[PDB]
Design an enzyme around this catalytic site. Structure first.
Site, PDB file in Angstrom:
ATOM      1  N   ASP A 195      45.096  62.312  38.098  1.00  3.21           N
ATOM      2  CA  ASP A 195      44.668  63.164  36.987  1.00  3.21           C
ATOM      3  C   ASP A 195      45.429  62.935  35.668  1.00  3.21           C
ATOM      4  OD1 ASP A 195      46.545  64.156  38.682  1.00  3.21           O
ATOM      5  OD2 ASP A 195      45.924  66.239  38.585  1.00  3.21           O
TER       6      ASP A 195
ATOM      7  N   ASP B 131      31.014  35.738  42.360  1.00  2.00           N
ATOM      8  CA  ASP B 131      29.914  35.632  41.421  1.00  2.00           C
ATOM      9  C   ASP B 131      30.243  36.363  40.133  1.00  2.00           C
ATOM     10  OD1 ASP B 131      28.238  33.901  42.812  1.00  2.00           O
ATOM     11  OD2 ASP B 131      27.001  35.449  43.698  1.00  2.00           O
TER      12      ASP B 131
ATOM     13  N   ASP C 186      56.940  37.961  40.937  1.00  2.51           N
ATOM     14  CA  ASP C 186      56.067  37.992  39.762  1.00  2.51           C
ATOM     15  C   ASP C 186      54.635  38.341  40.145  1.00  2.51           C
ATOM     16  OD1 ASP C 186      55.790  35.458  41.083  1.00  2.51           O
ATOM     17  OD2 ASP C 186      55.097  34.529  39.219  1.00  2.51           O
TER      18      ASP C 186
ATOM     19  N   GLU D  60      51.466  37.002  40.403  1.00  2.00           N
ATOM     20  CA  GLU D  60      50.619  35.833  40.414  1.00  2.00           C
ATOM     21  C   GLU D  60      49.213  36.220  40.858  1.00  2.00           C
ATOM     22  OE1 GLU D  60      50.990  31.127  41.623  1.00  2.00           O
ATOM     23  OE2 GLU D  60      51.440  32.744  43.060  1.00  2.00           O
TER      24      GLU D  60
END
Ligand SMILES: [Ca+2]
Ligand SMILES: [Ca+2]
Ligand SMILES: [Ca+2]
Ligand SMILES: [Ca+2]
Ligand SMILES: [Ca+2]
Ligand SMILES: [Ca+2]
Ligand SMILES: [Ca+2]
Ligand SMILES: [Cl-]
Ligand SMILES: [Cl-]
Lengths: 329, 329, 329, 328, 328, 109
Positions: free
Chosen positions: A23, A109, A197, A199
């Site tokens: 919220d 896609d 990190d 990636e």
RNA sequence: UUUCUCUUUUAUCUU
RNA sequence: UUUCUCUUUUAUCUU
RNA sequence: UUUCUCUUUUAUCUU
């Protein structure tokens, strides 16, 4: 304080999407503040679901870094853990199809790759004080998606290789680092990047079950099975770098355990130029050294989970840890 | 710190985000460039309300002057359908301002503009009988028009009022507050425009779609029926997002409560009206309050449990002082 | 003083076109100083008209934000107010046709939209001290142009919607805030923007009467009627955001009340590239925070109206209020 | 003072070239900070201009539609006998359904931030002929009131576009140059503030169905066609850009047209687009006065050659006015 | 010191490109502060040049008329056998009626602020041929005095344009370049101050009706034609621009011509134009000396390519002289 | 014009004998479906009547109390001061809440 | 029902 | 998430 | 539109 002013707008938003309550966080933030600044699409997935628990049965919920799916569940005999005879069924975030199509070969896609930022979950009991029973246990497993190699007596004979979920075995024991309170008290918890990190990960095609079609559970090492079902409704589009939240919910016999289940997911995707998605994209936020070190600290600092009660007090608990460690620096 | 706000500018921020049960003169008005004569109408509703079991009752806090809220119940686990019609619950003295005929609304006042729109639900059931949840999200419902042709003699083209964005009520918005029924809830809405422009009073409206209009022509997903022109009606649509509240009552659940609604509205009085006696100039521009209003609003959660209704004013003041701090740097 | 130097040339001119007398203001000013700076055409409309009042009859004059029309009048039985049996006839500013054509469907031929800046009016008695009688009362109504919705028993049955003047009812009573002196003393008064900002309004096509053709006064709620007459001579091209000045002029029996009537209108239009008007256009003046806050203050400060006598003393009365409120800042 | 990240982005989406990987940005920096979804609509249209024709392209603040095109004999302007057909931005249907009553299904309202257009000649150098001319019109969507002799007699009110009569002539404030040189132009908010406009239902034609072009006053017609492929979902507060490509006889005029559009929509909680939504950027006084200034300063349009030297024209104006005000 | 808003606008209408949405401005900043109406006249003319012809376009300070055009065989200049026909600015009639005695009906007098002209080739690159040449002439409207043997014998005095003989040759101070490159040029006040000239009644031709071209001295003729479509309403104090488009045989020279004109008119209280009127801007010494300097510095004309880099040429000169005088 | 009706029933059991000068207390009691709401209801009324010499009532009469300026102004103050209603809980704490308001306003005098 | 300062911010009474 | 002392008791960095 | 005191008399901001 002088900590909240060192952060960039992005850097702050980032930290909220990560640990803030659903919220409070009305703004998903432009994304992850790091070295990467290419075109992306920030999507904050949110599932709200009225769920009632089967009495005399422990129900296990797994939160994994899988795009388009909130969680995976399965119920087993009370007092027990999953077995080879167990299979988890995924619950999709709204519009999973609008993102990853309807066929196991049309996931990439709309988008090619992704990376998770936050992945929270909460359980809000709705049972009255004359009907609730049971407990909510929570721990986190470092489940990662690898591969397995084995030979096959075909003609000619060949060697196989398929996807396997490594470290799934952790779900069969409540690790020492865990949350565990009465059902009625609910629970709230988040997960964070299990890598140094952020990636990007590739979108995975054709994945519907694990072990996949034509593979014995035996040859994968996985302790149990994952089934997304009809390729037309759900499926496994990828696996992020976030530890997986595990939740055991014990429901005694004759106990009415009703609750609301919520799930957050701040995901950054790489939009395909063709997608009707692309028009909502923007550039990834610039590096914010501060926010990144804060993230890490806050993360390691916060408790496994907290009771549903202090879900709101969360944001504050966080803002505390920040000024505390940014003060000693 | 909070001394940079004009007396009204402050009052304004209170009428706005806090339930001013306190008997101040109800609001001063809006600290905007406008300073013409207006009448600050403080609308307040106290409605005792019992929720039928097995039904998911829906309540809409819309910016329709004179009406506190609109409701209707649908079977549990479901949302409104074309077969649904919402009935308005008016604030006290509706007729005392808008008459008793769909063509006598503009009699007392000509235009208006909302400032606050708050609502709270305070459970009154015991802890052994209640069950269920309260879910809340807000919809950008505006009031547009639909253009279609009719086969009359001669054939002609129509144009009527239609509510756009209603489709938002058919699903639980991602940005939402959801928690056990017994915990109640408090939430408020805000101006969905960059400024506080005035809206005209609308004559003749009693139903949407309008009588003689087939539903779906408008494209609305359900219907709005204010009933007898002599008891209620639709006098206008403010520039506030509408608040949606789903209270799902499971089977055999005794969920009762008290609902409260607040509405600070600036109306332009008509000299022939007695009401005009209580008109005063709108407050002068208070740049600070207008900038705070915006900041506070964006900060606050979708909603909060009934309990934190008190800590509300306080929660606000802290957000302000916290904002005024960053303004010095 | 140090107030008159903070304003930009435009900002000053603006304030004059607004409250200054017609003679002092030889320069209409480049327009409205606000955020908008697009192409416009400033047109200061001025009507001078020798008018004699009907004895034993109260004549009502309405000044409304209608482009190309100075005012609207109608005479009624002495001691009475308009009734359903009353209809107001508009008096056009010079060259109304050269602006809005001659057919109810060729108003937007020269200009597409507009916005009023000033709208003043004055009455200068010309009767000798042996012939004057009666009084001049003045108040302002917040008349706005809305719409009404009602069903029609046609075949097939349909729902209508047409323009309605809301808050017209205010003209039937002299509101507490009013000017009211002996006829001989004349009167002078202006009107101002009844909105927080100066938003443009669309030019309205086909409007000749209100209630329009084929509509009963009953279904509109309007207390009386507005008739612009032959589309070839006058008409209602739009409705601005300025409160409407109302004027009751009581003429006793046997009283010779002769006077001159003047009207000002600083209007900013959006010229159509095709119009032979366009070549006179320029860009709207840049924002002048000062002038805008001054405007608001002066406006709310000035009295309803003043006697014709102090029409010139006006500009000064204004320049006073400015230094007074700009000094306390 | 200086600009905010969003306030800067806002000025780029506004006048910035789209080949700059322009950031939609978080939106418009104004008083409003409500939830919204930023959409950066882009259309690339390969198009050949009929010789001996004067093709008229109109950029209007109609959501989901890149432009409206109509053609008339060389030397003439649109007439009552003319109808403009819209070319939709990609995924029009994904936003406003396939019914004339499915527009407000995804979003309730909107407001434009930018609206640019570009024409890049692809013709060789001997084949081409004609000229490109541009001017802008303050076209706004109003209403017309006329009576109808039905039983019983009634009064009819409908939408009617005002200020179209401005397309029937070449506005004095205009750009005019050889076709081949291409062109780039943009429009700006024709209102003092960026207020939200509602989504409009049922609009497919103007004049609408069953209304004579005579009843509306409109000089010509607007047809979106099949409610399942296009339609009029609303009219924003941006001046409408008019482009007249004058192709003479035996002239081969081929070119690409691009259309930009930064729009902020109020998402419906139920719409898929809602997840993508954030909050409108906080008010940024600077940018709001720069926008206004840059706009007034920029030329009607420029040859496509100076489409990249555009951003630098702006950066220049930004600091040239941040200079006459930075001294004192 | 610095310029006033009007003084700056004044310098833009003066040399500023019209594609800049140039502001008419409040007018001319000089001692005069009287009521006036600013009109920004703009004409866009598509035009094809006759091959083997040398078309002569004259920009003159004649109100309501964009230009006068006449054509002569390639290699030649106008002759006694020549007559120039005017092309009116839009709405000529709306300003000066339809009678040769209805000119002073709307406005009594006037004074020019700017008078620019541009030619934008629309020809392809192989079809075109010829060159554009420009020079300016100090053409002024005088009077001629000759006797007439009537009964009784009398003396006749009439209008006659002086300095036209300058069009019969290419002034040394001239711009000359390939047709295709286009061209842009402007004129300036040929007087030390901006005095008002009166509106002229009855002028339709020069030589006027019943006067031989021999009596006037004028090298050729000026015909406005039907007093109901055009006419000579006055002669301003601006040098007249001369443009010679030399088209050779088999040359396809098509192009657009634009004409700008910032004029300040003294409105008649009865005219509709009066409402639009304001007061002339207060004297702005700076601008009045800049105008004078910029003018003298600028080149006769430039290729249409540098029509946008025009404003920047000016801003440069403005601060390059506000520099040799800012040091001490 | 009355919005609803008042019926005292059989003249032999009840009826409307008069209407005093006291505002009328209104009470809405919402009972949900399946809720058992049982309670005790109490009502007070200090009324002063003018006895008819014939009534077997008259023998209990006495004279009205003398004017008490104080008590009258206290009454008014306390009245306007007290809240609409209080929860049943603090019914006893009532008398005290009152005695407070008295000393508070009689102290500032 | 509790405690004062502070600026509030209106509001009359008095010169 | 709060406050220091005390000895803790490991642990490296330095002579 | 003018000048302050005085007590007013409400009204928030702060301990
Ligand atoms: Ca294993
Ligand atoms: Ca507005
Ligand atoms: Ca719909
Ligand atoms: Ca009415
Ligand atoms: Ca028209
Ligand atoms: Ca000569
Ligand atoms: Ca009654
Ligand atoms: Cl649900
Ligand atoms: Cl007169």
């Amino acid at each position: 304080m002088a900590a909240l002013t060192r952060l960039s707008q992005p850097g702050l938003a980032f930290l909220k999407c990560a640990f803030a309550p659903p919220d409070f966080n009305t703004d998903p933030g432009k994304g992850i503040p790091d070295r990467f600044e290419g075109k992306v699409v920030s999507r904050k997935d949110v599932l709200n679901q009225s769920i009632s628990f089967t009495a005399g049965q422990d129900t296990f919920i797994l939160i994994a870094p899988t795009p388009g799916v909130a969680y995976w569940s399965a119920s087993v005999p009370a007092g027990t853990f999953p077995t080879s005879a167990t299979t988890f069924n995924p619950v999709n975030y709204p519009g999973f199809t609008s993102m990853f199509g309807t066929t196991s070969t049309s996931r990439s896609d709309q988008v090619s790759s992704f990376r998770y930022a936050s992945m929270n979950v909460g359980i809000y009991p709705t049972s009255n004080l004359m009907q609730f029973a049971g407990s909510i246990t929570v721990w986190k497993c470092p489940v990662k998606l690898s591969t397995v190699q084995f030979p096959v007596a075909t003609d000619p004979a060949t060697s196989s290789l398929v996807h396997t979920l490594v470290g799934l075995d952790g779900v069969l024991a409540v690790g020492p680092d865990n949350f565990s309170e009465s059902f009625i008290k609910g629970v709230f918890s988040q997960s964070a990047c299990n890598e140094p990190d952020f990636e990007f990960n590739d979108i995975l095609e054709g994945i519907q079950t694990l072990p996949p079609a034509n593979v014995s559970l035996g040859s994968t090492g996985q302790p149990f099975t994952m089934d997304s079902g009809a390729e037309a409704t759900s499926g496994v589009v990828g696996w992020g770098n976030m530890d997986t939240i595990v939740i055991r919910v014990s429901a005694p016999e004759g106990a009415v355990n009703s609750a609301i289940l919520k799930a957050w997911s701040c995901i950054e995707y790489r939009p395909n130029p063709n997608a009707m998605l692309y028009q909502f994209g923007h550039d990834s936020p610039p590096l914010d050294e501060v926010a990144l070190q804060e993230y890490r600290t806050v993360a390691r600092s916060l408790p496994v989970a907290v009771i549903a009660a202090q879900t709101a007090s969360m944001w504050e608990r966080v803002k505390s840890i920040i000024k505390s460690s940014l003060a000693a620096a």
